[PDB]
Design a protein around this ligand. Structure first.
Ligand code: MN
Lengths: 276, 100, 9
């Protein structure tokens, strides 16, 4: 019922090997819906979900134009960043940008975003107020001064409170079959002997959307979050995600342990045990 | 410059059933910089025409990618994912285990 | 849909 739209961008320089690689993707929630890759033969932004395919030719031309212009700006900015950090022209560097908006159940803006990183670290970010900046260092402060002189924050604020929210709302409606449907996890516990003395209980969650989920083991009602191996939530490749949580238990003590599952597609949270 | 070595999971889209067509996934995440090389292996030999997602990143700026291909698990055939990245001194191989 | 405007670092 609350939703997000995000555009992610990455430029990576590669001296001696042409112009920087530029890749950008767009998501609504955990659903990919557009992509652009500068290294395709005649690059265009392409659809990746069925509900964006209905946008006409004019939509795809404007997006592609934006993608190509963003690439050229990034190319120049990478050269600029070499001056700001007194760096050599020899190595490969990375420029990332994310921007987008969150909306609440009634479609009003909850939060806007616009932030950059250089070489995997924070560079400059628009603050939640959409009117002021956080620069991470004295280099980013040069960008901040330029952006304050050109009133960039005010311009970003108009996009984020207006078009970002309005287009996110359109997409949520056109894609309501999938975007407004949560698939609950399919769950079970497996049992894996380590030795005669102990065994691993693994609690599984499969086939769920969106990605957000909580998986915990308890032992006679007490959380085990120093003994729980919890893997990162991972894509199945068919829109859904997977996750598991594992605890080592002594032989015979398996019924003291319960697994607890919270996901937005479930009526109530689940409580599971090993069932030989 | 701060580099971050990839996390690696290799797993199936659906529960593994011998004889049944499935997908083999290798999910690489949490890494920086973005250049990375990933192969899927069947009995130690590179599977051809493996597909992958487009480079994106998480809130902390670290990158992730999914590599994948159709496969049919059997009881004898061994599958794996080989990853190379600037933080690794040699390629890391993680074997597919249907219980993980 | 994407924003039209952008600004150099
Ligand atoms: Mn013993």
């Amino acid at each position: 019922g609350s939703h997000s739209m995000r555009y992610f961008h990455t430029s990576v320089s590669r001296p001696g090997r042409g112009e920087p690689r530029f890749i950008t993707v767009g998501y609504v929630d955990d659903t990919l819906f557009v992509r652009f890759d500068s290294d395709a033969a005649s690059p265009r932004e392409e659809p990746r979900a069925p509900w964006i395919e209905q946008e006409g030719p004019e939509y795809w031309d404007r997006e592609t134009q934006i993608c190509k212009a963003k690439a050229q700006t990034d190319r120049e900015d990478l050269r600029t960043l070499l001056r700001y950090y007194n760096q050599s022209e020899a190595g490969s560097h990375t420029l990332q940008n994310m921007y987008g908006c969150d909306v609440g159940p009634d479609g009003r803006l909850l939060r806007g975003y616009h932030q950059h990183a250089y070489d995997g670290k924070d560079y400059i970010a628009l603050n939640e107020d959409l009117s002021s900046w956080t620069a991470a260092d004295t280099a980013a402060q040069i960008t901040q001064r330029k952006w304050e002189a050109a009133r960039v924050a005010e311009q970003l604020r108009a996009y984020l409170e207006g078009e970002c929210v309005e287009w996110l709302r359109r997409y949520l409606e056109n894609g309501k079959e999938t975007l407004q449907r949560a698939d609950p996890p399919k769950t079970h516990v497996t049992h894996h002997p380590i030795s005669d003395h102990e065994a691993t209980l693994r609690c599984w969650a499969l086939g769920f959307y969106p990605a957000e989920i909580t998986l915990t083991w308890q032992r006679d009602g007490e959380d085990q979050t120093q003994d729980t191996e919890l893997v990162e939530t991972r894509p199945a490749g068919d829109r859904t995600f997977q996750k598991w949580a594992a605890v080592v238990v002594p032989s015979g003590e398996e019924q003291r342990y319960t697994c607890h599952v919270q996901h937005e597609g479930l009526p109530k949270p689940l409580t599971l045990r090993w069932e030989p | 410059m701060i580099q971050r070595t990839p996390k690696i999971q290799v797993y199936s889209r659906h529960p593994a059933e011998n004889g049944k067509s499935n997908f083999l996934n290798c999910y690489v995440s949490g890494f920086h910089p973005s250049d990375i090389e990933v192969d899927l292996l069947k009995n130690g030999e590179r599977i051809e025409k493996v597909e992958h997602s487009d480079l994106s990143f998480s809130k902390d700026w670290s990158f992730y990618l999914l590599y994948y291909t159709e496969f049919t698990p059997t009881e004898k055939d061994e599958y794996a994912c080989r990853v190379n990245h600037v933080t690794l001194s040699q390629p890391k191989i993680v074997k597919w285990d249907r219980d993980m | 849909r994407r924003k039209w405007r952008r600004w150099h670092l």
